[PDB]
Write a protein that binds this ligand. Structure first.
Ligand SMILES: CCCCCCCCCCCCCCCCCC(=O)OC[C@H](CO[C@@H]1O[C@H](CO[C@H]2O[C@H](CO)[C@H](O)[C@H](O)[C@H]2O)[C@H](O)[C@H](O)[C@H]1O)OC(=O)CCCCCCCCCCCCCCCCC
Ligand SMILES: CCCCCCCCCCCCCCCCCC(=O)OC[C@H](CO[C@@H]1O[C@H](CO[C@H]2O[C@H](CO)[C@H](O)[C@H](O)[C@H]2O)[C@H](O)[C@H](O)[C@H]1O)OC(=O)CCCCCCCCCCCCCCCCC
Ligand SMILES: CCCCCCCCCCCCCCCC(=O)OC[C@H](CO[C@@H]1O[C@H](CS(=O)(=O)O)[C@@H](O)[C@H](O)[C@H]1O)OC(=O)CCCCCCCCCCCCCCC
Ligand SMILES: CCCCCCCCCCCCCCCC(=O)OC[C@H](CO[C@@H]1O[C@H](CS(=O)(=O)O)[C@@H](O)[C@H](O)[C@H]1O)OC(=O)CCCCCCCCCCCCCCC
Ligand SMILES: CCCCCCCCCCCCCCCCCC(=O)O[C@@H](COC(=O)CCCCCCCCCCCCCCC)COP(=O)(O)OC[C@H](O)CO
Ligand code: SF4
Lengths: 168, 147, 206, 361, 114, 100, 110
């Protein structure tokens, strides 16, 4: 019933369609590099969806990390492991494929019933626009243990990854 | 005036032999040749410094002697007239055949007068001679510019 | 046998255009194209150095827009500078065919228009590049003064300004291609790596 | 004046659904910034070709226009009409997309280029951080141009390009971090309005780090590794012919005017004819609604932005012909071994000086 | 609800900027020579023919340089809201951020020592 | 644009990521599916933060942490894959079965 | 890798052009007479050239597939093309292209 809300609905559904198609391409396509780039497509669409949800900092952070760091890492590694893909078909395949399909559809139906059934508490008060200063306040007041332990997490990840991918 | 109509073709059909004065960078007279070619006239440029009498090369025959280099003792070729042979090989609906001369500065006043006179006879035959010069692409009838 | 090496004598005369708008747009199509020629950085022998002198400060072809390019994909002009031996002829045709269609050729020096000083008693030099690729301009002379290469550039610009956008049909390749099976014993290539790791380099034979 | 106010009001005077007028105005700045970006690209090409010629006792293009002014126009129009090639076994869709992914986010970062206050497209809250995030998509474009080629020559160039563009993203972020410490925020207008009487004089190390990192974005002959002709032929560009190559030729100069404007706004300021101009109450001007003074100060601000953007464009295309190239390993040691430590040190120093002397920070 | 002010321009400008390549590259496609198919379609190998095989001799040279980049890319994300909000925090947040930065410095030293 | 739509979208992305995590045969594609799953989680967190807890946004900080650690786990997983490839010389996930 | 003898108006390869590619084969010996259209061709002249190519590749070949022998075949094909042009079976194109008479100028057979 407005021009702003109409744009916010059309953009949401466009980004949702982009997410679904790119995420199906990531997992269904036979070529792996097409999947590696459609993954960056997924990440960009989700970064847009964040901006559409009043979260401007975390969207830019996602664009930094996912489609700027993790995607580049995945592209490098996909190049490192090219050997012309001589995958011979295995008999016990339709079994696991059908099982994955049915369990996925069932879990999705279950989650959709749970989401459409539960009465969420909408709390109709407009959110805050300055969403980065609040995240800055929560890093050192409330979430101080995780903010401090993420450093050691990154350090141990660096150590272990250099050890595993080293050459000797 | 930064864009030209078709006055060049009218002036060529009137005079018969023009004398261009292109600027010494050579990218601003090709459009006038394209104007000529779009009307129906066919061009053929042959770099005047390198033709013979201009009467044995254009009207009559002439025995070209290629470069024997110790082998292949002197032989002549007798290539056909560079004009009478190209007037026969015109496209079906061809308005004529104009002759383009790039380095007209090397020729002499006698040869210029000859090329001017050759336009009246030999009907379907016009002449353009890029005598070097002015900083704009200006032309002038080749009967003039001499004497 | 009336006239040896005859001419075409064609039909369907020109189908050229005349309206002022399309020829005025052709003016720009030909002005943008001739005043921004990008030569391929391709030298083989002596003449290349004069070409390099034509790049230097003493007189640069940077004016009238010439920027030397390394790959043939961006180059639209190949100034063949140097003698083309039979060992390297296919290495030039390639570089010429591997290069976009509105392209041009200048044969500089005597060794690329007639064979030059090697047109006699030489068993490896290609006697002129006009028998490999369609040359546009010839400038004669063992190494031509680099203000003769620029004269060739002038004579090539005034040829480019002649083209007609309604005439780009004479720019594709017809490809009249055939096929014939053979029986000719393919041999192994004798040109690989293995120069210092070859077993014959490490110890003399007994 | 507030041209937006007048436009929307005069458009609502004849009806047209006032809320819809605000939608009918977005194309106006969204294409004014495109116009200034394209003119900046033409200026950058012309300046490079005419300054490299002066440095070398030479003359640049002079037979195209009056002074070679039409040289970039000719070089672009040629690449438009050029036949495009797509080699034998190369991919068909990542080929024609690399040169576009390396260009779209370079244009999109012009949202935050101020050119004076109220003279920019939508001063954003993320501002410079959004640019740091958007400048991380070009490596995807280079990996895409390298992966979609049957030429192992150019895959090795795409890899060494995507590995240089990520080496100079951490220091380029640690310099903007120290700038945002003082700036109290991230929006470019809020970053620059702290200059009310310049950050270069208080961040003399962050300026150096930012400038070096921006010049090392696969841009200048100090590095320009994937364009270093001698060591390797054009790197990944060696297979693009027509407009697809002009997209590289263009996305590398817009990525230079952008960096010049950004150094201007971060460390110098697209405002402020050096004296504290807005304290010109000495001419008793009621700026507030002065119909002119507004246009006079607008012109002054635009000129003062362009002076300091041209300063850095000039200095970059001057260093191009002054600094010798580094192989690739002397390059990857600038980042991660000299620029990253000095970036961290500058950040800690700005933090210590902001905690101790909260005035002037 | 949507309270992010400045957005309206990022969407429209994203559209108008994505339209620049897909319009220039289409104008070039309309007016340019057709095909050049036969041998124009080979790979540039300095004029010679591709040697055959055509591999790369894979190297970890460019996985490690992306691992270490991901680490500090996350570091900058963690450090941005600390810097933007350094006013309301004051002291005792400088200490925690300093511990964070010291841990990341030891990480960099470890990566630089191998 | 309601909370239920965002949650259903996140659940469907979770579904697709699970399918790719179980079905795919290449070894990097399972890691990409794990990334899809973590994105499906972050979308839940941001939707809840935008609608329910909109003032002291706490799903967004949790999402920042999730993004951090997804990057870290990817950095470790590609290392594990490079290690297994350097020895088995393949990434066919149907050949890493040293059992009966 | 390809093995080819490429000159003006003769292009012999060692593969099969499936749609525009080349695909080295080791027995196809494709041929591409006059790609740049220096000359104007007829149906009888192209058939004569194909017949010469066949009798040159088939009747005289038991030797190696070195590029030397490919050049040796291309040279004979081009001498045959020049002889055809001398006798007058074909002629130069005369179109608005480069027009450099690479095989000789027109003479009058005296
Ligand atoms: C290829 C590169 C070059 C290509 C050129 C670009 C193509 C466009 C060609 C058209 C040029 C004709 C326009 C005439 C310029 C005068 C218009 C002007 O100044 O208008 C200015 C107004 C001002 O806007 C108002 O400005 C007010 C006050 O100025 C403020 O501006 C800044 C913000 O604080 C300053 O800090 C200043 O102190 C502050 O007071 C308020 O900010 C209002 O909010 C704001 O709406 O904006 C506006 O409409 C301006 C919007 C149009 C932008 C076009 C500007 C072009 C630059 C021309 C500069 C000329 C220099 C001198 C020319 C003669 C040679 C000596
Ligand atoms: C029916 C079919 C319809 C189809 C539609 C398609 C048809 C297209 C219509 C015609 C095309 C016209 C294109 C340009 C027209 C100019 C419009 C304009 O003037 O638009 C004005 C715009 C808008 O910003 C202005 O903004 C202020 C108003 O504030 C608001 O303006 C913005 C929008 O809100 C910001 O959000 C700002 O924060 C917000 O508060 C001003 O006072 C004006 O009101 C407002 O218009 O100007 C700006 O955006 C600033 C950007 C310009 C700055 C200029 C600096 C110029 C650069 C120097 C030039 C030389 C460069 C060469 C060298 C380069 C080397 C580096
Ligand atoms: C995001 C949006 C961005 C979109 C991108 C924008 C794309 C813009 C594309 C257009 C750019 C075209 C620039 C042309 C500049 C130029 O021509 O160079 C100027 C040169 C300089 O020589 C001149 O020539 C004269 C000498 S002479 O007589 O020619 O010899 C003399 O004037 C002197 O030499 C010199 O002045 O002029 C010429 O040499 C002759 C070329 C003729 C040009 C044609 C005129 C233009 C007509 C346009 C078509 C209109 C159709 C309707 C007309 C009836
Ligand atoms: C007031 C403006 C009014 C119109 C403006 C239009 C401008 C752009 C289009 C120009 C008009 C002709 C376009 C047709 C498309 C096409 O290429 O057809 C194919 C034919 C090729 O001819 C053809 O060649 C074809 C083969 S081939 O593929 O080209 O090799 C062949 O099939 C065909 O028979 C042969 O004729 O080419 C043309 O028709 C024109 C192509 C080049 C024209 C360039 C003009 C340059 C203008 C830009 C500068 C202006 C500055 C800014 C102005 C805004
Ligand atoms: C890095 C690659 C991309 C990653 C991310 C991509 C995803 C895109 C980002 C998603 C953007 C989010 C949704 C945009 C919100 C639209 C509605 C809106 O923003 O509300 C504003 C208003 O919304 C609009 O009016 C915009 C609707 C029009 C936008 C449509 C796109 C324009 C298309 C080009 C123009 C075409 C015009 C001609 C059409 C005939 C609010 O106004 P304000 O900022 O002034 O705040 C105060 C307000 O004025 C009153 O309180
Ligand atoms: S053309 Fe003359 S100068 Fe050039 S390489 Fe041949 S012999 Fe030497």
């Amino acid at each position: 019933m407005d021009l702003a809300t109409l744009t916010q609905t059309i953009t949401f559904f466009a980004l949702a369609a982009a997410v679904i198609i790119a995420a199906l391409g990531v997992v269904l396509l036979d070529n792996v590099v097409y999947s590696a780039f459609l993954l960056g497509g997924v990440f960009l669409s989700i970064a847009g969806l964040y901006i559409l949800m009043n979260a401007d900092f975390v969207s830019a952070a996602q664009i930094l990390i996912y489609v700027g760091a993790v995607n580049v890492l995945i592209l490098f590694a996909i190049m490192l492991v090219n050997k012309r893909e001589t995958y011979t078909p295995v008999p016990g395949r339709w079994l696991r494929q059908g099982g994955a399909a049915v369990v996925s559809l069932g879990v999705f139906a279950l989650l959709t019933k749970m989401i459409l059934q539960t009465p969420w508490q909408l709390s109709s008060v407009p959110p805050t626009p300055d969403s980065i200063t609040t995240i800055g306040q929560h890093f050192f007041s409330d979430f101080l243990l995780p903010f401090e332990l993420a450093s050691v997490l990154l350090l141990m990840a660096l150590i272990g990854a250099v050890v595993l991918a080293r050459r000797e | 005036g930064l864009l030209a109509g078709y006055q060049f073709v009218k002036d060529l059909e009137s005079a018969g032999a023009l004398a261009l004065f292109v600027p010494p960078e050579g990218g601003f007279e090709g459009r006038y040749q394209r104007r000529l070619r779009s009307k129906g006239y066919t061009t053929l440029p042959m770099s005047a410094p390198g033709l013979g009498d201009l009467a044995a090369y254009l009207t009559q025959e002439h025995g070209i002697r290629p470069a024997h280099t110790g082998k292949e003792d002197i032989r002549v070729y007798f290539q056909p007239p560079l004009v009478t042979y190209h007037l026969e090989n015109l496209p079906p609906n061809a308005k004529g055949l104009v002759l383009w001369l790039i380095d007209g500065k090397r020729l002499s006043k006698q040869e210029f007068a000859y090329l001017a006179q050759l336009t009246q006879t030999l009907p379907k035959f016009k002449v353009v001679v890029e005598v070097g010069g002015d900083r704009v692409v200006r032309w002038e009838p080749l009967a003039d510019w001499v004497a | 046998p009336a006239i040896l090496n005859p001419i075409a004598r064609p039909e369907v005369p020109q189908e050229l255009a005349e309206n002022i708008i399309l020829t005025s747009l052709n003016d720009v199509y030909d002005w943008a194209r001739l005043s921004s020629l990008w030569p391929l950085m391709y030298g083989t022998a002596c003449c290349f150095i004069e070409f390099a002198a034509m790049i230097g400060s003493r007189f640069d072809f940077d004016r009238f827009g010439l920027v030397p390019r390394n790959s043939p994909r961006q180059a639209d002009l190949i100034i063949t500078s140097g003698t083309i031996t039979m060992k390297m002829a296919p290495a030039l045709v390639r570089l010429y065919e591997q290069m976009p269609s509105p392209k041009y050729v200048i044969a500089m020096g005597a060794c690329t228009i007639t064979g030059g000083m090697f047109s006699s008693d030489s068993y490896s030099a290609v006697r002129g590049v006009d028998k490999l690729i369609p040359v546009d301009v010839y400038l004669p002379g063992c190494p031509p003064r680099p203000e003769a290469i620029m004269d060739a550039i002038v004579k090539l610009r005034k040829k480019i300004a002649n083209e007609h956008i309604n005439e780009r049909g004479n720019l594709a390749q017809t490809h009249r291609l055939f096929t014939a099976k053979h029986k000719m014993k393919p041999v192994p290539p004798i040109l690989t790596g293995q120069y210092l790791n070859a077993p014959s380099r490490q110890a003399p034979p007994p | 004046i507030d041209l937006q106010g007048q436009f929307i009001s005069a458009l609502q005077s004849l009806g047209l659904s006032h809320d819809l007028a605000k939608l009918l105005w977005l194309p106006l700045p969204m294409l004014m910034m495109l116009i200034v970006a394209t003119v900046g690209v033409l200026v950058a090409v012309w300046l490079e070709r005419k300054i490299s010629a002066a440095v070398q006792q030479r003359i640049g293009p002079e037979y195209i226009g009056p002074l070679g002014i039409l040289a970039p126009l000719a070089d672009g129009l040629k690449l438009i009409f050029k036949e495009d090639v797509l080699p034998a076994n190369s991919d068909r869709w990542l080929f024609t997309l690399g040169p576009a992914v390396v260009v779209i986010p370079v244009f999109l970062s012009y949202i935050i280029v101020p050119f004076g206050q109220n003279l920019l497209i939508s001063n954003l809250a993320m501002g410079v951080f959004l640019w740091i995030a958007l400048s991380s998509i070009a490596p995807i474009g280079l990996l895409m141009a390298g992966y979609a080629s049957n030429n192992k020559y150019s895959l090795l160039g795409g890899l060494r390009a995507a590995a240089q563009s990520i080496s100079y993203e951490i220091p380029l972020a640690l310099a903007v971090l120290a700038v945002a410490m003082m700036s109290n925020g991230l929006g470019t207008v809020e970053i620059v309005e702290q200059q009310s009487q310049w950050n270069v004089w208080r961040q003399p190390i962050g300026f150096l780090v930012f400038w070096i990192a921006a010049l090392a974005e696969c841009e200048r002959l100090p590095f320009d590794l994937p364009e270093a002709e001698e060591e390797l032929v054009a790197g990944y560009q060696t297979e693009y012919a027509g407009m697809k190559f002009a997209l590289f030729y263009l996305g590398a100069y817009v990525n230079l005017v952008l960096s010049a404007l950004l150094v201007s706004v971060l460390y110098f300021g697209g405002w402020s004819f050096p004296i504290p101009l807005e304290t010109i109450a000495n001419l008793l001007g009621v700026s507030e609604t002065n119909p002119f003074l507004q246009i006079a100060f607008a012109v002054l601000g635009i000129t003062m932005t362009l002076i300091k953007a041209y300063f850095f464009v000039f200095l970059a295309i001057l260093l191009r012909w002054t600094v010798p190239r580094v192989r690739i390993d002397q390059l990857l040691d600038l980042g991660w071994k000299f620029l990253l430590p000095v970036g961290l040190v500058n950040l800690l120093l700005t933090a210590g000086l902001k905690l101790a002397f909260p005035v002037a920070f | 609800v949507f309270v992010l002010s400045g957005y309206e321009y990022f969407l429209g400008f994203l559209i108008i900027c994505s339209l620049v390549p897909v319009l220039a590259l289409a104008a070039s496609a309309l007016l340019r020579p057709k095909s050049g198919r036969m041998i124009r379609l080979t790979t540039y190998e300095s004029g010679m023919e591709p040697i055959g095989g055509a591999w790369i001799q894979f190297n970890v040279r460019y996985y490690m340089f992306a691992l270490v980049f991901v680490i500090f890319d996350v570091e900058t994300v963690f450090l941005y809201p600390w810097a933007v909000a350094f006013h309301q925090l004051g002291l005792l947040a400088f200490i925690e951020a300093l511990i964070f930065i010291a841990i990341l410095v030891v990480a960099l030293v470890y990566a630089w020592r191998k | 644009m309601q909370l239920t739509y965002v949650l259903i979208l996140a659940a469907l992305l979770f579904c697709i990521g699970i399918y790719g995590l179980v079905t795919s045969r290449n070894a990097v594609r399972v890691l990409m599916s794990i990334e899809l799953l973590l994105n499906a989680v972050n979308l839940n967190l941001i939707g809840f933060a935008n609608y329910l807890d909109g003032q002291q946004i706490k799903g967004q900080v949790f999402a920042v942490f999730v993004i951090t650690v997804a990057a870290a786990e990817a950095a470790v997983g590609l290392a594990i894959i490079l290690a297994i490839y350097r020895n088995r010389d393949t990434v066919d996930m149907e050949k890493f079965n040293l059992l009966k | 890798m390809l093995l080819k003898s490429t000159t003006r108006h003769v292009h012999i390869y060692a593969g099969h052009v499936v749609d525009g590619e080349v695909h080295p084969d080791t027995e196809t010996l494709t041929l591409n007479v006059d790609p740049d259209n220096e000359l104007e061709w007829n149906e009888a002249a192209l058939a004569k050239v194909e017949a010469k190519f066949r009798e040159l590749v088939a009747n005289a070949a038991g030797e190696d597939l070195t590029e030397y022998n490919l050049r040796r075949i291309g040279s004979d094909l081009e001498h045959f093309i020049r002889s055809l042009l001398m006798q007058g079976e074909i002629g130069y194109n005369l179109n608005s292209r480069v027009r450099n008479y690479s095989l000789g100028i027109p003479r009058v057979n005296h």
